[PDB]
Design a protein around this nucleic acid. Structure first.
Ligand SMILES: Nc1ccn([C@H]2C[C@H](O)[C@@H](COP(=O)(O)NP(=O)(O)OP(=O)(O)O)O2)c(=O)n1
Ligand SMILES: [Mg+2]
Length: 431
DNA sequence: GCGGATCAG
DNA sequence: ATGCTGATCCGC
């Protein structure tokens, strides 16, 4: 159980340098919360009243603009990496496995997820939650191929769909539903790998068709979420996981019912921290997020409480925007400790090289270079430089990064930098 | 623009 | 022993 999990994790992790840095970060967020409470205390019923008035005017503007006509779907491959590793090695099918290394786990099967073993967890810890664990190395190109197959299926229903990662996507199947209402039985017929099955004309049905085709073509299961906007769809896709779906019917009441007791943590954008801060105000669900809208208008910036309000009303994008041009590119690498300056400069040079190579791949030229440095106590710092003309080759990037690094090395003199990670990043591309 | 931080996958 | 990429946000 949770007690046993947190117990052995803590027992095996206590007093590490990582653990220390986590205590530091925890302390800092606690501080942020302290400040926010002290700022809550100086709020008068008056300015609060004015707040509630303005906020409600805006909210009215929102609820007026609500759109329910579109059908939005979110597909999420189940335990992806691990599912693929299981598909092609049946000697694992009934065992707890994780895709990753000893350092870090990309993911785990549900069979192992029952031991608290999860993504973003170090391997050696996961093997202490579960010593019978099989850690199988990742085969990224396979995952990309399967991804291609799945996207091929998805393009049938929404050509202009939006792929998140290798295993996630949003589809706008309004057009398809429209054209599918008057579809003969033989455009909805698929063969099991003459032996057929047929699918209906409802959204629910379109989605089980897609999931079916995916299982046939790839031998892998996916979950899906069906809702009138992206936010809602994304929350849906996780309810009936794995290999299941869920629809929110396009009526305001359904939206509100689904929302009213939805934990804020489950919406995309609200992580551990924001959850803790909102929990400090006694906000856990979206109902309470709606109630305290004015208070939030006074406590948070315009962007944050606007967002919070959208969430609390169940709004979200209903139009999938074309995957835009990128805004940054970066390479970073973790290694066992590096003290010697010349080696650090060399490392920098190499990273800059790879970066110049990637920029070359996309023909990109930018004028802001940032170096990233993570020391052995896990403290991270970045340093940037924006220059007049755009930059592209390994020589230029190294020219800048070299002197940023120089600056840090000198700044710490006569001490050596004790690095565990190093990165170089470029941005400020043209318009 | 800079630097620290949050979040997702 | 062993803890990547891109985007955005919050003050400055
Ligand atoms: N922290 C993370 C999260 C995901 N990943 C990789 C491995 C995952 O297969 C994929 C993330 O997709 P995901 O849907 O969030 N997780 P996963 O498919 O494993 O399980 P489900 O929650 O979908 O059942 O990217 C990672 O490498 N590090
Ligand atoms: Mg998945």
């Amino acid at each position: 159980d949770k007690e046993k999990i947190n117990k052995i994790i803590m027992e095996a992790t206590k007093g590490s340098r990582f653990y220390g840095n986590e205590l530091k970060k925890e302390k800092q967020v606690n501080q942020r919360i302290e400040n926010m409470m002290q700022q809550k205390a100086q709020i008068t019923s008056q300015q609060l009243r004015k707040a509630q008035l303005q906020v409600d005017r805006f909210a009215m503007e929102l609820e007026q603009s609500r759109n329910l006509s579109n059908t939005i779907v979110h597909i999420d491959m189940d335990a992806f990496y691990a599912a693929v590793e299981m598909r092609d090695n049946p000697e694992l099918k009934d065992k707890p496995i994780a895709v990753g290394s000893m350092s870090m786990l990309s993911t785990s099967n549900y069979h192992a997820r029952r031991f608290g073993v999860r993504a973003a967890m170090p391997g050696f810890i996961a093997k202490r939650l579960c010593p019978q664990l099989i850690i199988v190395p990742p085969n990224f190109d396979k995952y990309r191929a399967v991804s291609k197959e799945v996207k091929e299926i998805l393009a049938d229903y929404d050509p202009n769909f939006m792929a998140m990662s290798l295993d996630e996507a949003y589809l706008n199947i309004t057009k398809h539903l429209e054209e599918r209402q008057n579809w003969p039985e033989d455009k909805r017929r698929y063969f099991i790998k003459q032996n057929s099955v047929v699918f209906g004309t409802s959204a629910q049905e379109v989605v089980k068709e897609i999931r079916f085709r995916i299982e046939q073509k790839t031998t892998l299961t996916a979950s899906a979420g069906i809702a009138p906007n992206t936010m809602l769809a994304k929350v849906c896709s996780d309810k009936n996981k794995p290999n299941g779906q869920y629809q929110i019917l396009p009526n305001r009441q359904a939206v509100m019912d689904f929302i009213k007791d939805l934990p804020i943590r489950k919406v995309s954008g609200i992580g551990k921290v924001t959850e803790k801060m909102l929990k400090a105000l006694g906000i856990i669900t979206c109902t309470e997020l709606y109630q305290q809208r004015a208070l939030l208008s006074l406590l948070f910036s315009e962007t944050s409480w606007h967002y919070f309000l959208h969430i609390s009303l169940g709004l979200g994008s209903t139009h999938l925007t074309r995957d835009g041009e990128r805004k940054s590119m970066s390479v970073e690498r973790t290694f066992s400790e590096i003290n010697k300056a010349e080696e650090q400069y060399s490392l920098c040079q190499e990273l800059c090289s790879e970066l110049a190579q990637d920029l070359q791949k996309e023909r990109l030229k930018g004028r802001t270079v940032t170096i990233k440095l993570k020391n052995v106590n896990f403290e991270v710092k970045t340093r940037a430089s924006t220059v007049s003309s755009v930059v592209s080759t390994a020589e230029e990037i190294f020219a800048i990064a070299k002197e940023l690094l120089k600056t840090e090395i000198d700044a710490d003199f006569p001490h050596p930098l004790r690095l565990r990670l190093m990165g170089v990043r470029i941005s400020s591309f043209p318009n």
